[PDB]
Paper text:
One such protein, N-myristoyltransferase (PvNMT), is an essential enzyme that catalyzes a post-translational modification (myristoylation) through transfer of the lipid myristate from myristoyl coenzyme A (Myr-CoA) to the N-terminal glycine residues of target proteins. NMT-mediated myristoylation is crucial for membrane association, protein–protein interactions, protein stability and turnover, and signal transduction. Plasmodium species possess a single NMT gene that is essential for survival, and previous studies showed reduced parasitemia after NMT inhibition. PvNMT has a prototypical NMT topology and adopts a compact, spherical configuration consisting of 15 α-helices and 19 β-sheets.
The co-crystal structure of PvNMT with a cofactor (Myr-CoA) and a peptide-binding-domain inhibitor (IMP-0001173) was determined at 2.3 Å resolution. Interestingly, the asymmetric unit contains two copies of PvNMT: an apo PvNMT and a ternary complex with IMP-0001173 and Myr-CoA. PvNMT has a central core with an internal pseudo-twofold symmetry axis formed by the N-terminal and C-terminal halves, shaping the site for binding peptide substrates. All of the loops near the binding cavity are ordered in the monomer with bound Myr-CoA and IMP-0001173, whereas the loops nearest the binding cavities are disordered in the apo PvNMT monomer. The partly ordered apo PvNMT is the only reported apo PvNMT structure in the PDB. The myristoyl-binding pocket of PvNMT preferentially binds glycine residues, ensuring its substrate specificity. In our structure, Myr-CoA occupies the extended groove that runs across one face of the enzyme. The postulated catalytic mechanism starts with the formation of a stable complex with Myr-CoA, while the peptide-binding domain of NMT accepts the N-terminus of the substrate protein. The Ab-loop above the peptide-binding pocket adopts an closed or open conformation to control access to the active site by forming a ceiling or lid.
Residue numbers in the entry: 27 to 227, 234 to 410
């Protein structure tokens, strides 16, 4: 039925659009028409504008997500975004504090709901649109199935619309109406012994079969530094234009999203005499291991953006796995987007247990295979 989503400007469950269609569902929107007041919450609940740069607010967001965010189908792991990651994820250039929205339970004064968006230029079927990138929607486990998620979505939609922005992009593992693209995920084992020991995935033969060659194919790769921003902007910017869906980065956005932050985002570059010719990037999202004696955290690296001009893509992604190993990661994760599907079998990737769906809000266009997706969300 999709009681809530049936009222939103999104395609229907079985919709299909011709290849020549690329337009909003609802256009000619006026800012003056947006509801000026916040939507009413149920009794005992209060809106709370979060200041992610304030330690207390950021600590409360972290605690909510650490306890109540996405778990695997068997409840063995829970995503454990670090507070520094959340700051990086939510304070991109031109971000709006009023787009970090929480809900507090009045009787305990605790954050029980959260949703967030950041502004970004999204290029969909070669048309660039100012959108909001929605992420980190979370409702406390004690309050699930209370219809709190729709009012979070409607309120952040209101605060996005008040900025004259009428489109949005978001990803989710669940099937909603209706994915513009759908990308399965794959896993490259690094610490084999640990992955079996925690239930993530011959013991001695497997340790040898999935070994990671200890030598890079691109010898010059070093951690990105701020002088590399222009080169990375040029390299990544021209690479992404070949896809049906990607973000249009400014130099400022290149600096924010790719300059290294320990345990958050790792970007390596091949800088030959000041020319950025190759880049490897992946971000750190550890998963809390629920109720395990030996291990507490699974250190997982997530493929971000990788561009190569002096080598093949298989060689580029081969170095990415080794660079993740050298940073003490247990597993290297990747979606079948961009050129990633072509390297999965030769680099011994294991197929995942599900897929990540890409969505556009208030945009009507034909869907496409994930190889035409050129954007990776956090
Ligand atoms: C122009 C700007 C527009 C901006 C807005 C753009 C859209 C943004 C959309 C959000 C982008 C999110 C991006 C991410 O962060 S994806 C991250 C998703 N977060 C989690 O899974 C964390 C763990 N789970 C939870 O915290 C809760 O289960 C959540 C909050 C996810 C569901 O809460 P709850 O379990 O208490 O449910 P309810 O009774 O309140 O509400 C029931 C309705 O909620 C719909 N639902 C369930 N899961 C999702 C989901 N992942 N995206 C969108 N909708 C979802 C569902 O179809 C149903 O609608 P309908 O079937 O009746 O129609
Ligand atoms: C990084 N965006 C987080 C939210 C969007 N989503 C659901 C998502 N985006 C990209 C992915 F690549 C991805 N997947 C990799 C697969 C995976 O690692 N599965 C085992 C596992 C370990 N820890 C957890 C915690 C929760 C669920 C599964 N877990 C699932 N999921």
């Amino acid at each position: 039925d999709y009681k809530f989503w049936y009222t939103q400007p999104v395609p229907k469950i079985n919709d299909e659009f011709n290849e020549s269609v690329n337009e909003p569902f609802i256009s000619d929107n006026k800012v003056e028409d947006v509801r000026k007041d916040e939507y009413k919450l149920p009794p005992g609940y209060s809106w709370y504008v979060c200041d992610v740069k304030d330690e207390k607010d950021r600590s409360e967001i972290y605690t909510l997500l650490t306890d109540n965010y996405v778990e695997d189908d068997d409840n063995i792991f829970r995503f454990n975004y670090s507070a520094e990651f959340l700051l990086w994820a939510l304070t991109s250039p031109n971000y709006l504090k009023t787009w970090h929205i929480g809900v507090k339970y009045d009787a305990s004064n605790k954050l029980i709901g959260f949703i967030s968006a950041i502004p970004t230029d999204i290029c969909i079927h070669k048309r660039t649109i100012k959108m909001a990138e929605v992420n980190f929607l979370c409702v406390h486990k004690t309050l699930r199935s209370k219809r709190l998620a729709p009012v979070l979505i409607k309120e952040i939609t209101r605060r996005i619309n008040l900025e004259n922005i009428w489109q949005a992009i978001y990803t989710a593992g669940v099937y909603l109406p209706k994915p513009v693209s759908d990308a399965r995920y794959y896993h490259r084992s690094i610490n084999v012994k640990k992955l079996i020991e925690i239930g993530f995935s011959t013991m001695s033969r497997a340790i040898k079969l999935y070994r990671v060659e200890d030598t890079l194919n691109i010898k010059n790769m070093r951690l990105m530094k701020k002088k590399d921003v222009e080169g990375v902007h040029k390299l990544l910017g021209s690479y992404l234009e070949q896809f049906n869906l990607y973000a249009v980065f400014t130099k400022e956005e290149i600096a924010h999203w790719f300059l290294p932050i320990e345990n958050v985002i790792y970007t390596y570059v091949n800088e030959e005499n000041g020319k950025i010719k190759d880049m490897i990037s992946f971000y750190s999202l550890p998963s809390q291991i629920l109720g395990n004696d030996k291990y507490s955290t699974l250190n997982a690296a997530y493929s971000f953006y990788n561009v190569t001009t002096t080598a093949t893509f298989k060689q580029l992604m081969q170095d990415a796995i080794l660079l993740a190993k050298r940073n003490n990661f247990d597993v290297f994760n990747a979606l079948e987007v961009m050129q990633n599907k072509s390297v999965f079998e030769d680099l011994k990737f294991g197929e995942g247990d599900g897929s990540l769906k890409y969505y556009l809000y208030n945009w009507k266009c034909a869907s496409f295979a994930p190889a035409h997706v050129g954007i990776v969300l956090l």
